Structures are given as structure tokens and as C-alpha cells.
Design brief:
The PDB classes it as membrane protein/isomerase. This is part of a larger assembly, with 2 copies of chain A. Chain A has helices spanning 2-11, 19-25, 30-43, 50-53, 59-68, 74-77, 85-99, 104-107, 113-119, 129-136, 146-157, 166-174, 183-186, 201-213, 215-218, 225-239, 255-258. Chain A is an all-alpha fold. In chain A, 22% of the residues are buried. The interface between A and B is small, with 7 and 4 residues.
Chain lengths: 265, 368
């Protein structure tokens, strides 16, 4: 199906970075039509696995997709969701994801996610961009600017620390830290500033999820290790305060893991 | 009737620019040019086309099953659905699609290597009057399809390029008998001692002599015949059909103006009554659609040169500088014998002038 529709489309005709920008000031026809074309042309990918790699003429459509359409994607991945707004970018991320290397992960980073924690403070209609994006900003799970992202996105995640869909944003940070190296090592104690501000239960789960992966950073390179003891002491006194410790006391013995590798706000 | 492998064909698309039926032909250059262009064939009565850069050769013709096999590592006839391998009949390169650009099209040029899907083209019929699988015939307006780029060999407005849109490509037979004359040869004109144009460093060599010695072997005395027909221009050569003679080393046409002189003038001055000479067996048919039969053997020949418009006889006057002048009778030595050359000599001969005309452009652009 993919192949035949692609050929059909290419017979006919239909600055393609200029159209989504020039119509943005000017009645929602072409800015929706082009995003739907992006969604259609991105759905007919060759594959998602070595079928795309280790086969023939699944690559031909992939070449045609980048040959008649080079990206220019900043008109979609940046300029549309900073006040239509969530969905058009949600098509473009799929078209870039299916068809299109470690430099590019930092290239588009903090584009859009900076508005997330800003507009999250009025939870409305364009603030359902985030409940929409709880999957499509997480699926790019697969130090220059990365210290910004753990700055911003955790400041979005602490906005809820939609309801059961926050588990996607949880693994979006617990696995983003896991591929750390110095700024992330300082981020291995970031929630300790909120573990003292902990005592919903998700605020303690955000402590526990990074608690086990905290020791990987100071296992590699080995100031606030005494502050880790200060958080362990607030956890030792907070253990007397309390499935209540199923996310708490799992990290409490794991503070010996935090002692096993180095040696709100 | 039909088209086979190891044949000689041309590719020719006829466009219309403001009610002017322009029969453009496909022409690649090679030896410094990886891109193809268009050759005019409509205005052939005052500016003759170049023929050596537009003829092709079909090498092989498989079905897609055998091509996908052989890629995974006699004279057959072609069927609409075979992926063929064109090649440039002079330069020796294989025609293909390239990943360059000049839109969402691709450019078309030659390459030396034959592997990959690049130099393979499946024919497609362009009629309901003939259909898949059946036999090709002469003059069928068809479509070509890239195997690699999955695109059509399109003529655009003057790019020839591989596009998503289609256009027609009429073909025409050219060639297919040892020891005889075929329209397209490169030959010397033996006297006893041969026809010559003098050495460089100038006249612009526009005089014509008869000479002897080692200049028989050298690259000056090379002449290419170009018959007035477009299709079947690589047939046999029989008496009575006219032909231009081109000097190969210089690229200027051997033109007679019976008042002025026998000189060498350019493509844009080569008139059909000015220079289209013919040989006669004595010193006193018109068109057959085929490669003809064997007329003129090489060593046993007395070719007496005679114009169409004047009908004179090029005889020598009185270095060895027996300068050729069209007389009304001539002597008994105008039966000039013939000697065809070999492929490597003509290959050197064309590339000499092709590099000369680029070096001189370099020199004048540097002196500017």
C-alpha cells in the first residue's frame, strides 16, 4: 500500500518551508493540509527495523522522501507552538522520526520544551499540547545543552509531581539520565533539593527513580556528597514518619548505593 | 523491422517551440563532460548536426528476474519490459542517471562502471496499439524508465533530466559487411600520397593539398563522412547519394565555392548545395530504407569527386603542393583510392580537437 500510494502521489505536484510560515499570519486550510500531508507521507515509511536496512527498494521510497523534500523543519518543529499549534509539530516529528547522528539530538533540543513548564502554570486549550505531547516528546528517548533539558523538563515533570500518562514522562527522564556526564552528575542529586521538599507520592517516586541511577555518575568519576548525607538523614528521620515506603525505603537502602560508588525550589 | 542488441540507434524527441517542429536528439559528450544535452536535427540544411555524439549501442537486454539475479552477485531481440543497457557508441561509456541537480528531478550522464542499477533502463510502450511482452519495432514512440531512480527520461524546458513526468523518445536504426563503406567512417584519401591540410601555428589551415610521406599516418589527414539522411545514416555507401566531408582534426567542413575557392568553413556555413559532393565510378538510386548492399571495396576503387551544384572535378594543380582545384575535366588521377582507419585513431582524433577547443577557451579567458 505504502509503495503504490507513494508513486501515485509523486506523479502529480502536491518553498515548502515558506508556506507554513507565510500562512501563519493570515482560515486554517493550508496549515492543516500540509501537516496532514506530512502525516500521510510519514505513515508510509519503509519499516522501523532491519527490514528498512537489510532489504532492497524499501530504500528507494526513503530516498525519494528526502530527495524531493529536504527537511527545513524549524518552521514546524519550532515556530508553531509558542503562544494548529500542537498537532502540526506532532506530524513533523513523525516525519523526521520515521525517515531521518548524535549531534542532531542536541540540535533540536530545547525547541518547544522551554514553553512547556511556562504554559503549564495555567492548567488551558493550548495547554493540552502537553497532554498530547506526553507520548511524542517521550518517544525520542531513542555537556553542551543537555543540562538545560533536565533543567526544563523536570521543571515540567515537577508540575505533576494525563494522570496515569505521567508514567511516560517519568521514564522519559529516568532513561534520559541513564545515558549520561558532569552536569548529569550534578543532576544525580537534583531532586534532593526537592526530596527535602517532598515530606505528592510522585515527588518521592521522582526521587526513587533517579536514586538507583544516582551512583552510576560518581562510580565513573570516583561537594554535595555531604548534602547526599543530609538528604539521607532527612530520609532516615522521614522513614520514622511512615506500600508507604515501597518507593521510599527502596531508596533508603539504596543510599548505601549512594555511599557505594563515590567511596519545589 | 525490429531492434536487436549490438545495434546502432539514436534517441530523438520532437518538441514544438512556437509552431516550429524541433526534432531534438540526445547527445552526450564525454572526456570532460558528465552531462548530456540536445542536438538540433531540424535545421539540417544549413547547420549539419554532429552525429558522432548522438549514436548509441544496445549492449544487453535482460528481464528483471535475471537483472535482480546478476546484480545479487548472438543477437537477441528486445521486448517491452526488458531493462536495457545503452552505451555511447563513440566514447565507450554507459548512459545512466546521476544524483546531482540543476525541482525534484535528477540529471543524466555517462559513467564508466556498469554495476548498480544506475545504467539500466526498462522500455515502456506508449500506446494501447502495442502492449507488454511483445516485440519492438522500428519507429515506435516509447518511454524509458530508470531502474535506479524509478523516474522517466524527461525533456524539460533546456534540461534533459530524470523526472517524475514522462515524454516520448522516438528511435531510429543506424547500422547493424566487412571491407565496404559505411556512412560514418574515418578514412584517408589515397592518391598513389594522400589528401592533406597543412600543419598548425597560424591561414587557419583552410587550404587543401595533396602530399606524400609520413603525413599519411599522422592525425591531419582524417575525414568523416556525414550523409544527408537522419535515420539509416550508418547504411552502406552507394553512388549518387550526397554526403558532407568533415575534417576531423579541425572540425571544419570541406566546402566548395566555385567562384571563390575550395576552403573549410564552419557548421553554420555548410550549405547542402555548397559542399555535398558525390563520387562517381566514371568521370562523366536515391534512398533505400535499410543498410543496403556492398558497393565500394577499399583498395579496388577509383572514386572521382564531383559536386552537385557545379558538377566539376577536383583535380590537383601544378613541400609537395599539388593544390586541389575543381577543374571541368581533370586528368586521369582523380580516381582517388580509399583507406579506412581504425577505431583508436579516430578516438584519438576526436579527443584532440575536443581538448584543443577547450584549451583555447582557457587561454583566451586567461588573457582576458
Amino acid at each position: 500500500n505504502a509503495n503504490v500510494v507513494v508513486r501515485l502521489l509523486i506523479r502529480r505536484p502536491e518553498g515548502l518551508l515558506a508556506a507554513m510560515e507565510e500562512a501563519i499570519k493570515i482560515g486554517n486550510a493550508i496549515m492543516t493540509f500540509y501537516a496532514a500531508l506530512i502525516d500521510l507521507l510519514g505513515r508510509c515509511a519503509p519499516e522501523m527495523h532491519l527490514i528498512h536496512a537489510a532489504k532492497g527498494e524499501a530504500i528507494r521510497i526513503r530516498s525519494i522522501l528526502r530527495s524531493l523534500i529536504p527537511l527545513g523543519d524549524l518552521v514546524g518543529v519550532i515556530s508553531i507552538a509558542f503562544q494548529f499549534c500542537p498537532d502540526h509539530k506532532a506530524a513533523m516529528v513523525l516525519f523526521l522520526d520515521r525517515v531521518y547522528v548524535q549531534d542532531f539530538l542536541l540540535h533540536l533540543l530545547e525547541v518547544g520544551f522551554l514553553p512547556d513548564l511556562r504554559a503549564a502554570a495555567s492548567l488551558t486549550d493550548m495547554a493540552l499540547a502537553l497532554n498530547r505531547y506526553l507520548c511524542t516528546a517521550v518517544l525520542p528517548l531513542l555537556l553542551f545543552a543537555g543540562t538545560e533539558h533536565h533543567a526544563s523538563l523536570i521543571d515540567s515533570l515537577l508540575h505533576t509531581v494525563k494522570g496515569c500518562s505521567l508514567t511516560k514522562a517519568q521514564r522519559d527522564s529516568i532513561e534520559v539520565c541513564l545515558l549520561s556526564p558532569s552536569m548529569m552528575q550534578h543532576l544525580l542529586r537534583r531532586l534532593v533539593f526537592d526530596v527535602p521538599l517532598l515530606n505528592k507520592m510522585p515527588l518521592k517516586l521522582l526521587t526513587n527513580h533517579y536514586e538507583r541511577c544516582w551512583k552510576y555518575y560518581c562510580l565513573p568519576g570516583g561537594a554535595s556528597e555531604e548534602e547526599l548525607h543530609l538528604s539521607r538523614k532527612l530520609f532516615w528521620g522521614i522513614f520514622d514518619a511512615l506500600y508507604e515506603q515501597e518507593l521510599f525505603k527502596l531508596a533508603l537502602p539504596c543510599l548505601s548505593a549512594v555511599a557505594g560508588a563515590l567511596p519545589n525550589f | 523491422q525490429f531492434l536487436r542488441t549490438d545495434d546502432e540507434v539514436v534517441l530523438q524527441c520532437t518538441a514544438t517551440i512556437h509552431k516550429e517542429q524541433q526534432k531534438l536528439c540526445l547527445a552526450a559528450e564525454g572526456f570532460g563532460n558528465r552531462l548530456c544535452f540536445l542536438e538540433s536535427t531540424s535545421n539540417s540544411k544549413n547547420v549539419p548536426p554532429d552525429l558522432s555524439i548522438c549514436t548509441f549501442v544496445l549492449e544487453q537486454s535482460l528481464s528483471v528476474r535475471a537483472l535482480q539475479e546478476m546484480l545479487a552477485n548472438g543477437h537477441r531481440t528486445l521486448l517491452y519490459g526488458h531493462a536495457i543497457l545503452l552505451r555511447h557508441s563513440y566514447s565507450g561509456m554507459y548512459l545512466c542517471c546521476l544524483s546531482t541537480s540543476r525541482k525534484l528531478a535528477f540529471d543524466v550522464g555517462l559513467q564508466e562502471d556498469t554495476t548498480g542499477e544506475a545504467c539500466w533502463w526498462t522500455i515502456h510502450p506508449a500506446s494501447k496499439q502495442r502492449s507488454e511482452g511483445e516485440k519492438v519495432r522500428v519507429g515506435d514512440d516509447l518511454i524509458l524508465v530508470s531502474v535506479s531512480s524509478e523516474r522517466y527520461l524527461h525533456l524539460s524546458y533546456l534540461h534533459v533530466d530524470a523526472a517524475f513526468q514522462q515524454t516520448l523518445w522516438s528511435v531510429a536504426p543506424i547500422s547493424s559487411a566487412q571491407g565496404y563503406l559505411i556512412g560514418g567512417d574515418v578514412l584517408r584519401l589515397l592518391h598513389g600520397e594522400c589528401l592533406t591540410v597543412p600543419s598548425g601555428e597560424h591561414e587557419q589551415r583552410r587550404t587543401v593539398h595533396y602530399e606524400g610521406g609520413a603525413v599519411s599516418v599522422h592525425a591531419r589527414s582524417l575525414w568523416r563522412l556525414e550523409t544527408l539522411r537522419v535515420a539509416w545514416s550508418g547504411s552502406h555507401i552507394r553512388w549518387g547519394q550526397p554526403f558532407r566531408l568533415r575534417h576531423v582534426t579541425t572540425g571544419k567542413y570541406l566546402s566548395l565555392m566555385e567562384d571563390k575557392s575550395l576552403l573549410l568553413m564552419d557548421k553554420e556555413k555548410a550549405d547542402v548545395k555548397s559542399t555535398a559532393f558525390t563520387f562517381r565510378s566514371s568521370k562523366e538510386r536515391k534512398e533505400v530504407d535499410g543498410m543496403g548492399t556492398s558497393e565500394i571495396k577499399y583498395g579496388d576503387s577509383v572514386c572521382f569527386i564531383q559536386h552537385i551544384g557545379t558538377g566539376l572535378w577536383l583535380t590537383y594543380q601544378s613541400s609537395i603542393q599539388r593544390k586541389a582545384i575543381m577543374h571541368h575535366e581533370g586528368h586521369m588521377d582523380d580516381g582517388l583510392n580509399l583507406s579506412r582507419s581504425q577505431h583508436e585513431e579516430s578516438r584519438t582524433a576526436r579527443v584532440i580537437r575536443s581538448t584543443v577547443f577547450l584549451f583555447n577557451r582557457f587561454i583566451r579567458g586567461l588573457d582576458a
